[PDB]
From a paper:
In bacteria, the highly conserved RsmA/CsrA family of RNA-binding proteins functions as global posttranscriptional regulators acting on mRNA translation and stability. Through phenotypic complementation of an rsmA mutant in Pseudomonas aeruginosa, we discovered a family member, termed RsmN. Elucidation of the RsmN crystal structure and that of the complex with a hairpin from the sRNA, RsmZ, reveals a uniquely inserted α helix, which redirects the polypeptide chain to form a distinctly different protein fold to the domain-swapped dimeric structure of RsmA homologs. The overall β sheet structure required for RNA recognition is, however, preserved with compensatory sequence and structure differences, allowing the RsmN dimer to target binding motifs in both structured hairpin loops and flexible disordered RNAs.
We have solved the crystal structure of RsmN at 2.0 Å resolution and report a distinctly different polypeptide fold to the domain-swapped dimeric structure described for RsmA homologs (Gutiérrez et al., 2005; Heeb et al., 2006; Schubert et al., 2007). The asymmetric unit contains a single RsmN molecule, with the electron density allowing model building of the first 66 residues from RsmN out of a total of 71. The RsmN structure is distinct and completely novel compared with those of all other RsmA/CsrA orthologs and reveals that the 16-residue insert between β strands 2 and 3 has the effect of redirecting the polypeptide chain to give a unique dimer structure. The RsmN dimer consists of a very similar ten-stranded interface held together by a sandwich of two five-stranded β sheets assembled in the same order: β5-β2-β3-β4-β1. The structure lacks the α helix at the C terminus, but instead, the 16-residue insert adopts a well-defined α helix between β strands 2 and 3, with the sequences represented as β1-β2-α-β3-β4-β5 and β1-β2-β3-β4-β5-α, respectively, for RsmN and RsmA. In RsmN, the noticeable difference is that the insertion of the α helix between β2-β3 sterically prevents these consecutive β strands from lying adjacent and antiparallel to each other within the same sheet. Instead, the α helix forces the polypeptide chain to cross over to form part of the other β sheet, such that the RsmN β sheets are composed as follows: β5A-β2A-β3B-β4B-β1B and β5B-β2B-β3A-β4A-β1A. Thus, the overall folding topology of the two polypeptide chains and their dimerization interface is altered by the presence of the α helical insert, making the dimer interface no longer domain swapped but the product of two docked folded monomers. Surface area analysis shows that RsmA buries at ∼4,453 Å2 in its interwined dimer structure; however, this is significantly smaller for the RsmN dimer (2,841 Å2).
Numbering used by the authors:
A (entry chain A), B (entry chain A): 0 to 66
């Protein structure tokens, strides 16, 4: 199954996607070749955009201001 | 160097990221572990959000309405 993260982002705010160190390379590459990552603009509430990300469990999703 | 794509997205519009079939698995996994993918909300022009994506060259970036 998939991890799902939707966050409000203002101008100049972002997200970094990386690979989790504890998951194996053969499997992550197969997660990403086969199904990929989906980015969705879910809502635009004025000066904010709610961005959804659906990604296999091996993908680390971190808001830029955290790391 | 990096591929860069910025597109206007309205509500319910998205992007799919996948891995290019012609690039080797060892290298792509190392592209993504080391540097990752950056998603940036660059501008919110009313009912549209301009979403930037910076990704290593091995990553295929496709607007949902194309494939």
């Amino acid at each position: 199954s998939m991890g799902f993260l939707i966050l409000s982002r203002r101008e100049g705010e972002g997200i970094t996607l990386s690979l989790k160190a504890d998951y194996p390379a053969e499997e992550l590459i197969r997660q990403l070749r086969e199904g990929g990552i989906r980015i969705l603009v879910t809502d635009i509430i004025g000066n904010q955009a709610r961005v959804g990300i659906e990604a296999p469990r091996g993908v680390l999703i971190v808001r830029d201001e955290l790391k």
